[PDB]
Amino acid sequence: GLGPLQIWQTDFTLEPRMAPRSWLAVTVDTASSAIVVTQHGRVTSVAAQHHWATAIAVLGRPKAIKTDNGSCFTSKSTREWLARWGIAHTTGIPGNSQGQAMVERANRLLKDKIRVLAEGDGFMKRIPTSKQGELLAKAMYALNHF
Amino acid sequence: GLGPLQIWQTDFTLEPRMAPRSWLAVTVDTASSAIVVTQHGRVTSVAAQHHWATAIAVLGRPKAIKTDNGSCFTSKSTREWLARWGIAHTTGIPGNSQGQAMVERANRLLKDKIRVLAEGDGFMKRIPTSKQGELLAKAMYALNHF
Ligand SMILES: [Mn+2]
Ligand SMILES: [Mn+2]
């Protein structure tokens, strides 16, 4: 009734430890603080849609999503994909200074967690491609569950 | 305090509409009835571990998981992977008749949902490989969120 509005913040951040699919798409559900992250080979409009398809399966459909003005978020293709799901999109104030510190903070916690767990498994540089998926899933678990 | 025990049921089911990665690994969290499904090319011990890595990221670590005696669930490799996470594993009673109707039911709801959504998009036989991921994610959303 009076609980938080279901607003997500989403952003992409680069992580060479996860190459070749080094772009991580990160969504923070601002009502719960849960984090959803997926890995992608290139930052395109279709990679953002594939990330949100997975975040929806996991967190439900939000009422709105806030992003920056990155072109994979403002293309015609991504605007139509969000209209097909009935989700409102805002890039907030222009020179907003950033109405998305929560996802910015999530991005740093996430890359720190990835580094600490990868180094615990003995991977000091790039994580071998066949170990990436389970280590990303472990970083996600660690940041969402207590 | 007196709520449901965190027990999952997991099973693999075959779905040719999703070929080549036609094996679907399905986990039902018996306390919440939430469903987690991932797609795999072969039914192996590593495909079950990769599915549970993702289910853990999404639902948290359970106290125990019930499966059938399928060899990808009873191998040495899968038993050690569950011991590393500290999760108890039971295949229930031997000739239990099936202590896993919930996941059995989830399997049929899931393949029905996949068929109805794929046919709504015009795919009457196999779903094209590049449309699979978003349609699986849509079937998962539809069965978990109201
Ligand atoms: Mn950005
Ligand atoms: Mn089975």
From Swiss-Prot, chains A, B:
Domain of life assignment: Viruses
Positions with a binding annotation for Mg(2+) 3: D11, D68, E104
Domain Integrase catalytic: 1-146
Cofactor: how bound: Binds 8 Mg(2+) ions per integrase homotetramer. Zn(2+) can also be a cofactor for the nicking activity, but not for the polynucleotidyltransferase activity.
Coiled-coil regions, chain positions: none
Needed cofactors: Mg(2+); Mn(2+)
Function: Catalyzes viral DNA integration into the host chromosome, by performing a series of DNA cutting and joining reactions. This recombination event is an essential step in the viral replication cycle. Has a strong preference for using the 3'-OH at the viral DNA end as a nucleophile.
Domain remark in the UniProt entry: The core domain contains the D-x(n)-D-x(35)-E motif, named for the phylogenetically conserved glutamic acid and aspartic acid residues and the invariant 35 amino acid spacing between the second and third acidic residues. Each acidic residue of the D,D(35)E motif is independently essential for the 3'-processing and strand transfer activities of purified integrase protein.
Record's subunit section: Homodimer; further associates as a homooctamer.
Annotated protein name in UniProt: Integrase
Lineage of source species: Viruses, Riboviria, Pararnavirae, Artverviricota, Revtraviricetes
Encoding gene, per UniProt annotation: gag-pol
Range covered out of full length: 1334 to 1479 of 1603
